[PDB]
Design a protein around this ligand. Structure first.
Ligand SMILES: Cc1cc2nc3c(=O)[nH]c(=O)nc-3n(C[C@H](O)[C@H](O)[C@H](O)COP(=O)(O)OP(=O)(O)OC[C@H]3O[C@@H](n4cnc5c(N)ncnc54)[C@H](O)[C@@H]3O)c2cc1C
Ligand SMILES: NC(=O)c1ccc[n+]([C@@H]2O[C@H](COP(=O)([O-])OP(=O)(O)OC[C@H]3O[C@@H](n4cnc5c(N)ncnc54)[C@H](O)[C@@H]3O)[C@@H](O)[C@H]2O)c1
Length: 271
């Protein structure tokens, strides 16, 4: 089996930026070389890495979920939204790590660490979820999984979706509700729709956008009760519901509406 990059979560591994690609107006794909062309990252499905750097004199550490997998040898791909300065009146300085990444030249390095996270997908509907960092995982096996993602929150979902569809004996059905500001902000749409086309029995896909185009067949607005009722499995199926998005999306749009529909807190997990 392949050499593993992340052997110890307490250790930092400097990886070299080798390629970069524009995804949309504010988002890019960054490809980093692993320690050798035959290495894999070593990242259990459901977990993430952290990038860290000293940026303008302060320590900055942020979590990312690669869009690559442990089937990929020799590289790791991150899809990252850049929060530019001088753009948002509420955040004139923009974002620290994302702008740092955007400023990197091919050949520059940045430290990776991992794997981390309370949730690990063990395949065939089986999730190992620690209540917190000091407790044993609770092993929950479900027939279906609800997923609510906003913006870059798609990456933890996509990692799980891909892991499932890869295994023809994994009968778990994923229902994704993916929220973004506008149509052009729907990250990884071609990948998601390719998955839908190939795995429609196991992958249900729905979008909402804050602001919708004229020709729009999906939903519009923040996540609401109707969207959760119509686009996630019903509470009676006892699915796990995973969420990843901006804090107010989780707090105000997801949780109260999950409760209205009848999904218990015990079934819900926020990345
Ligand atoms: C499990 C997990 C996986 C993640 N995976 C990814 C991923 O694959 N790709 C990815 O890009 N991110 C991912 N994130 C988010 C990531 O960790 C950071 O939060 C993000 O990159 C921003 O960090 P920052 O240092 O650049 O910005 P920060 O300095 O921390 O400040 C940014 C925050 O302030 C606000 N802000 C600042 N500038 C602007 C602006 N111009 N417009 C709008 N809002 C602004 C935003 O709320 C933003 O979140 C993931 C998070 C988690 C928890
Ligand atoms: C954090 O947030 C990251 C994603 O941030 P982003 O910049 O890509 O998201 P974003 O700013 O582009 O917003 C994405 C979606 O989140 C929801 N949202 C945003 N603000 C909200 C609010 N105040 N109330 C209810 N819903 C709201 C909306 O549905 C929106 O379309 C994730 O990586 C996660 O870890």
């Amino acid at each position: 089996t392949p050499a593993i990059t992340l052997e110890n979560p307490d250790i930092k591994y400097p990886l070299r930026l080798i390629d970069k690609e524009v995804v949309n107006h504010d988002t890019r794909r960054f490809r980093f070389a692993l320690p050798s062309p035959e290495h894999i990252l070593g990242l259990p499905v459901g977990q993430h890495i952290y990038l860290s750097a000293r940026i303008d004199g302060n320590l900055v550490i942020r979590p990312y979920t690669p869009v690559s997998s442990d089937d990929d040898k020799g590289f790791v791909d991150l899809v990252i939204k850049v929060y530019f300065k001088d753009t948002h009146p509420k955040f004139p300085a923009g974002g620290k790590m994302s702008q740092y990444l955007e400023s990197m030249k091919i050949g520059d390095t940045i430290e990776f660490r991992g794997p981390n996270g309370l949730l690990v997908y063990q395949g065939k509907g089986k999730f190992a979820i620690r209540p917190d960092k000091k407790s044993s995982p609770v092993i929950k096996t479900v027939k279906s999984v609800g997923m609510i993602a906003g913006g870059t929150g798609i990456t933890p979902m996509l990692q799980v979706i891909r892991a499932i569809m890869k295994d023809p004996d994994d009968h778990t059905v994923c229902h994704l509700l993916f929220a973004n500001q506008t149509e052009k902000d729907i990250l990884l749409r071609p990948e998601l729709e390719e998955l839908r086309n190939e795995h429609s029995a196991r992958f249900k896909l729905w979008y909402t956008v804050d602001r919708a185009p004229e020709a729009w067949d999906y939903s519009q607005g923040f996540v609401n009760e109707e969207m959760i009722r119509d686009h996630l499995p019903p509470p009676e199926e006892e699915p796990l519901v995973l969420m990843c998005g901006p804090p107010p999306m989780i707090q105000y749009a997801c949780l109260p509406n999950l409760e209205r529909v009848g999904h218990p807190k015990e079934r819900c997990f926020a990345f």
